[PDB]
Amino acid sequence: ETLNGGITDMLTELANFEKNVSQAIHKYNAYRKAASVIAKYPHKIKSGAEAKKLPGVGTKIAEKIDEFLATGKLRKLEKIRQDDTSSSINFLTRVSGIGPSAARKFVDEGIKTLEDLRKNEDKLNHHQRIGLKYFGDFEKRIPREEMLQMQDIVLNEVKKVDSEYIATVCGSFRRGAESSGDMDVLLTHPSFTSKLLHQVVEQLQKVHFITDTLSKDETKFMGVCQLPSEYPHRRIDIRLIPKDQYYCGVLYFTGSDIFNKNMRAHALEKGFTINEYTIRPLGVTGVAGEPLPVDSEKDIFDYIQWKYREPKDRSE
DNA sequence: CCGACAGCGCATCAGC
DNA sequence: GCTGATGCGC
DNA sequence: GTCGG
Ligand code: NA
Ligand code: NA
Numbered sequence: 192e193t194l195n196g197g198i199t200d201m202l203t204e205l206a207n208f209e210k211n212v213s214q215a216i217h218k219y220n221a222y223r224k225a226a227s228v229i230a231k232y233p234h235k236i237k238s239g240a241e242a243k244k245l246p247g248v249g250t251k252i253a254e255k256i257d258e259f260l261a262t263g264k265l266r267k268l269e270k271i272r273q274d275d276t277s278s279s280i281n282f283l284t285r286v287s288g289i290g291p292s293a294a295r296k297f298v299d300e301g302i303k304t305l306e307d308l309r310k311n312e313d314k315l316n317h318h319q320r321i322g323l324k325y326f327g328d329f330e331k332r333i334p335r336e337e338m339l340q341m342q343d344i345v346l347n348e349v350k351k352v353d354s355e356y357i358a359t360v361c362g363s364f365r366r367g368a369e370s371s372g373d374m375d376v377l378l379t380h381p382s383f384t385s386k387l388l389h390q391v392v393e394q395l396q397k398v399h400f401i402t403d404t405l406s407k408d409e410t411k412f413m414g415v416c417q418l419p420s421e422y423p424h425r426r427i428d429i430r431l432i433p434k435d436q437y438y439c440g441v442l443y444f445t446g447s448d449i450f451n452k453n454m455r456a457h458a459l460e461k462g463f464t465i466n467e468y469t470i471r472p473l474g475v476t477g478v479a480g481e482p483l484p485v486d487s488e489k490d491i492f493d494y495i496q497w498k499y500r501e502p503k504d505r506s507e
Numbered sequence: 508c509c510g511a512c513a514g515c516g517c518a519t520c521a522g523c
Numbered sequence: 524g525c526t527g528a529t530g531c532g533c
Numbered sequence: 534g535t536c537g538g
Contacts (some may be wrong), residue, residue, distance in 0.1 A: 216534055217534075218535095220512065221512085221536095248534095248535080250535090287531090287532080289531090292531090293530095293531085318518075405517095411515085428532085448513095512536090
């Protein structure tokens with residue numbers, strides 16, 4: 192952390208500025224990508240030229256690293272920090288439901304703080320009110336032990352609605368992470384292939400696990416949950432996926448991002464194409480065939496003739 | 508030089 | 524009322 | 534902002 196933490200912190204702060212104030216999502220991802228590859232770099236960087244050797248780091252970031260190494264700061268960043276508007280816009284986006292556009296709208300009309308948000312509840316939609324209500328809780332990490340307890344409840348209540356349901360908690364949790372930011376549940380049922388979600392949601396509300404709803408329709412639910420005691424309120428999403436697309440979904444939403452990118456790359460070489468939903472064979476001219484039958488996660492690995500990777504070892 | 512960079516489900520906004 | 528765009532989370 | 538056609 193102390194190795195290149197100053198550089199990675201700088202790039203992260205620049206990333207947030209680009210996403211929230213400039214609304215340039217690709218510059219945000221560019222800075223994040225650079226911060227990530229530097230955070231994995233097992234050496235204390237001595238120059239921008241050294242860092243430019245890394246993929247994701249180009250001329251501009253190399254220049255910024257040079258300034259940071261020689262002065263301990265970035266003139267552009269310091270000005271951004273001392274900017275009332277930019278800092279207020281940046282902060283407001285920390286409220287769930289408030290993105291760059293809403294934050295801009297709020298700051299433009301004098302709304303800059305949480306207190307300003309509370310005084311103006313009428314200007315906030317339902318999601319933003321919930322985000323405001325659980326501002327502190329939503330910025331807390333979820334320790335794995337709590338994730339296990341939360342998993343216990345979800346699997347139990349899901350089985351109670353119908354024992355033919357299949358539920359899988361994915362995300363970094365499934366990869367064995369010590370902590371998570373939210374709970375991502377993937378749900379399926381043999382009767383559904385290509386009102387099942389409501390029944391499960393309703394039951395989780397019935398036992399007071401789900402406390403609030405952010406967005407709810409046929410296939411994807413977003414809401415708020417809480418362990419019984421007081422535990423912090425947590426963000427939870429539940430996805431209803433067709434049975435024949437389930438394990439492709441489980442694979443996709445388990446990750447990691449870098450892992451999926453590599454598995455798709457290997458699949459391409461073997462003559463298969465993998466997305467979120469299906470794995471399809473490719474023709475001699477590049478045409479994708481019909482979706483292949485998938486009944487387990489290992490089936491996908493079998494098509495690619497790849498050794499099955501345990502979720503624990505899917506960080507890359 | 509210049510386009511890609513993930514994009515889908517859902518809520519809300521803009522226009523008819 | 525509707526359709527399509529925009530915003531947001533992940 | 535960086536990469537690559
Ligand atoms: Na580079
Ligand atoms: Na936000």
